[PDB]
Amino acid sequence: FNILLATDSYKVTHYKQYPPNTSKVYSYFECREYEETVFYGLQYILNKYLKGKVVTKEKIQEAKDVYKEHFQDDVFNEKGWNYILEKYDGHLPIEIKAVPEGFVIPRGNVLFTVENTDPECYWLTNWIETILVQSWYPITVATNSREQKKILAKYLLETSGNLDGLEYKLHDFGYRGVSSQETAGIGASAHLVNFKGTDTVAGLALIKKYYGTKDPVPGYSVPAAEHSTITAWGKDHEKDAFEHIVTQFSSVPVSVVSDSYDIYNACEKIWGEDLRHLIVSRSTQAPLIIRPDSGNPLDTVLKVLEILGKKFPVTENSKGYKLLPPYLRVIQGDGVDINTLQEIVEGMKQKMWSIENIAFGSGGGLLQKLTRDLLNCSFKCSYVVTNGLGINVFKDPVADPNKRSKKGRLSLHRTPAGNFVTLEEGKGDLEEYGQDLLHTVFKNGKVTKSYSFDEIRKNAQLNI
Amino acid sequence: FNILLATDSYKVTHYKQYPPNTSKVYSYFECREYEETVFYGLQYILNKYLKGKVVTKEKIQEAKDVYKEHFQDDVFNEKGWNYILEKYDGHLPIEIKAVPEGFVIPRGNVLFTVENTDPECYWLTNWIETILVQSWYPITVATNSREQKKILAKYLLETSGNLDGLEYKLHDFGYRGVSSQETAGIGASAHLVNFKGTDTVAGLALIKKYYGTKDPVPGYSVPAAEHSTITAWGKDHEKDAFEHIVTQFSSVPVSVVSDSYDIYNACEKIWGEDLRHLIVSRSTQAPLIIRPDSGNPLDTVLKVLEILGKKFPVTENSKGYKLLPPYLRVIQGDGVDINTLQEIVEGMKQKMWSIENIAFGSGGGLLQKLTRDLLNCSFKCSYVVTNGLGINVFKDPVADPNKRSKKGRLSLHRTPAGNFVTLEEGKGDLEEYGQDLLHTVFKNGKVTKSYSFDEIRKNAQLNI
Numbered sequence A, B: 001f002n003i004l005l006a007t008d009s010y011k012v013t014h015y016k017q018y019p020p021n022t023s024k025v026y027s028y029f030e031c032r033e034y035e036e037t038v039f040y041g042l043q044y045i046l047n048k049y050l051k052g053k054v055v056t057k058e059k060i061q062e063a064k065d066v067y068k069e070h071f072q073d074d075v076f077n078e079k080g081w082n083y084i085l086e087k088y089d090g091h092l093p094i095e096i097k098a099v100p101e102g103f104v105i106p107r108g109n110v111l112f113t114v115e116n117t118d119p120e121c122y123w124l125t126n127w128i129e130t131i132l133v134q135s136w137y138p139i140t141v142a143t144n145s146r147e148q149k150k151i152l153a154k155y156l157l158e159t160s161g162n163l164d165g166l167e168y169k170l171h172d173f174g175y176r177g178v179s180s181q182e183t184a185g186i187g188a189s190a191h192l193v194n195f196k197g198t199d200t201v202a203g204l205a206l207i208k209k210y211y212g213t214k215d216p217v218p219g220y221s222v223p224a225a226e227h228s229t230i231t232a233w234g235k236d237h238e239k240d241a242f243e244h245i246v247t248q249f250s251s252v253p254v255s256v257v258s259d260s261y262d263i264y265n266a267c268e269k270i271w272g273e274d275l276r277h278l279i280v281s282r283s284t285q286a287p288l289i290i291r292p293d294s295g296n297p298l299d300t301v302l303k304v305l306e307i308l309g310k311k312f313p314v315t316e317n318s319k320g321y322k323l324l325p326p327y328l329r330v331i332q333g334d335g336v337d338i339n340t341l342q343e344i345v346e347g348m349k350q351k352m353w354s355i356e357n358i359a360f361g362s363g364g365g366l367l368q369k370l371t372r373d374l375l376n377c378s379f380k381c382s383y384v385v386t387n388g389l390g391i392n393v394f395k396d397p398v399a400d401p402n403k404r405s406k407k408g409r410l411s412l413h414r415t416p417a418g419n420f421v422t423l424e425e426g427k428g429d430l431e432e433y434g435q436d437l438l439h440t441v442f443k444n445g446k447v448t449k450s451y452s453f454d455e456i457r458k459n460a461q462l463n464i
């Protein structure tokens, strides 16, 4: 990895475009005006990509050669990069201040700021915009996961009186559905800020290496069938498959995909009659989890629950809602996103089924079907020093007031009523609003403040 | 990287679920029934992740210890992985057959197949489903990019009578807007199958390392301003910024973002009047490229063109369409995806503006706002041998005939009319349709067939 090759190409040409005599460029990141965002993921980027000696004579030469062919022109700032190497031993003269990881902040507030600490490196603040803006992804995954957690909590609470097992109600199925192995790790780690169930193994080592937990691992799974392990038995032998599987995993929870041929037959006749004896004998800590995986997500869930409630003994919990026996549960892992998640729990509630009965798995909806536009993430320059004089800068496009950016040096504060405000134009210095919530997390190639994954989870907790 | 930790958790448990005495699992990938897909990107995965000694004693121990905590149980197949290490020196006993990279194949056809080459490793076929399914991403980027090239080619040909410069009409702006560095390189490389203009530098090294080109680099950029390089001058010095930048890059093309405050004033008064003398003196190989970046993408493009047409000498080309002078172009880089690209070129044509006048930049629309469900990409087991007996397997969910999978051993063939057909149930062996178009690309830890990026580009060419 070479940071000289990890920017948008045009930024290679920007040192020539700033006003002469500019000694400082100061920039900030926000989720421009999903009302609140979980701040998460900068720490990964700082450590993996930005810290320590990131410039070598070899990396300078490699970039020079690449850019000469890429632009068909010599535009690369070899002098500026050589300055960083000889003067700072390849360490970035940059200071980054950020809200603590896991913090839950309203839209349209400063989340982190970036500035150069040596006047020669004015061009470098925005060099690393590209790398840092990629923080949109763990923010957005963490925020969207936590929004699905609110929906789950609300409905579990209304239908059961408590939130037991909430952290296992939405399982990460997204490893195959994301764009790369690196994306898998990051996105899976962001989901684990809110939940504990994952099949995206990649998230585990990222957390262990960049954040840390007191528990041996941040995420857990259970044995579960796929269509290959059912269909391999042959079309007439679905029952044999089911029997073999629940018997292999008789004393842990086991999820068994039941829609290979006919989900409704599988529930009513195979589980419901032929194999019933192997189900009712199961432990409360070791249920069968029936998994549909096709059909209209809501209709399928409701029809599966209706079948199961006629074949197995159903109770009525203290809230008035129906509850399958403890050795029997359902997971809906097809077509699940924040919208369909809401539709299903509401549809369940209308039909008087407790949310205790159901869990969700989500792949693409959880980790891939998300863009930087969803929270309007944006990195902009708000302050420059030119000829020793600070000026407050910003954009304000005539046809889109929504792309207006903030002016000057910025700070984040608690308001008197306990909310948040971003102060502009250096007005945080007047100190009428308490301490800046932004902390220096990076300075001159060193990570200066770190959060464990346990503090992040605490910070991102629901109101509850 | 540890391949033993690069699968969906549940697959760690599958070796215990297949029928006893299973010696072969055979699986295939298709884009289930955008009617044609560009097959691209498997070779990256084969080289980066799958080839060579991928199993060590230390990787087996890492995974053993993680899985023990992750499942709270010993499910992990330590013996199976040890078998591979001892018997094959950690080389995977797997054969992958694939259509050539760059090939354009209709939906619902076999693209690659995976099978184990040692009966002991029957479980390994679907172990690596998760890693291989990630091929959806480069396939989908290359396909969607090529679909945009088709729209661009149509309207450029219609408005100008040729396709000159088509390969530079859609530029990759997506580095910051993807979910990771690895994704940026993969996606940017997929776009470069069709086009040559890119700001996502990560794409280049990926192509060089994994595919190779005749040319020193597979993609190119030009100098370009961003908002910080205009706004740093101060609201009242937008003209000074513009003058400095076009004069710094007076002999190469230069893109200048012009909507910091008022795109229409910038075009009509700053470029059109105050600085017009610095523009009309520019060379054909060094245009000024005006970049709007806000507003309704079509309305903004049409009004910018109308403004410039009144300030600059417009000609009418041989097809009857209006053409700005050759020192002056426009690039629309905000809000661009396949739908808005179509709307702008059609709206342009409607108002009699040649598509010569315009180029596009696209970030999230190009590399991020894409999922595995756009081409319905799916990896499934179709054939198994159990007790020396081969059986044709498949799923066929009752409530979704779209999820029906193919049966048995598969081959891809040319029809008598030169179309494509996927033969099922081993019927390729009858030889009524010529020879299988898949080639073994991986066998027993070695890449056995490879394509250069130049061959890929030729394969992926448009008809026209």
Ligand SMILES: NC(=O)c1ccc[n+]([C@@H]2O[C@H](COP(=O)(O)O)[C@@H](O)[C@H]2O)c1
Pocket (backbone or CB within 6 Å): A172, A173, A174, A175, A177, A199, A224, A225, A255, A293, A333, A334, A335, A336, A361, A362, A363, A364, A365, B008, B010
């Ligand atoms: N443990 C599991 O049951 C498990 C894990 C990973 C993926 N899956 C599969 O992934 C699919 C969901 O993918 P998307 O949400 O990306 O469409 C489900 O259809 C499911 O079959 C299942």
Ligand SMILES: NC(=O)c1ccc[n+]([C@@H]2O[C@H](COP(=O)(O)O)[C@@H](O)[C@H]2O)c1
Pocket (backbone or CB within 6 Å): A008, A010, B172, B173, B174, B177, B199, B224, B225, B255, B291, B293, B333, B334, B335, B336, B361, B362, B363, B364, B365
């Ligand atoms: N050379 C360039 O002008 C250039 C390069 C990379 C990104 N960008 C910016 O990225 C934005 C596009 O982002 P999305 O397409 O992902 O929304 C544009 O608004 C543009 O300002 C521009």
Ligand SMILES: [Mg+2]
Pocket (backbone or CB within 6 Å): A293
């Ligand atoms: Mg599935």
Ligand SMILES: [Mg+2]
Pocket (backbone or CB within 6 Å): none
């Ligand atoms: Mg699917």
Ligand SMILES: [Mg+2]
Pocket (backbone or CB within 6 Å): B293
């Ligand atoms: Mg922009």
Ligand SMILES: [Mg+2]
Pocket (backbone or CB within 6 Å): none
């Ligand atoms: Mg934008």
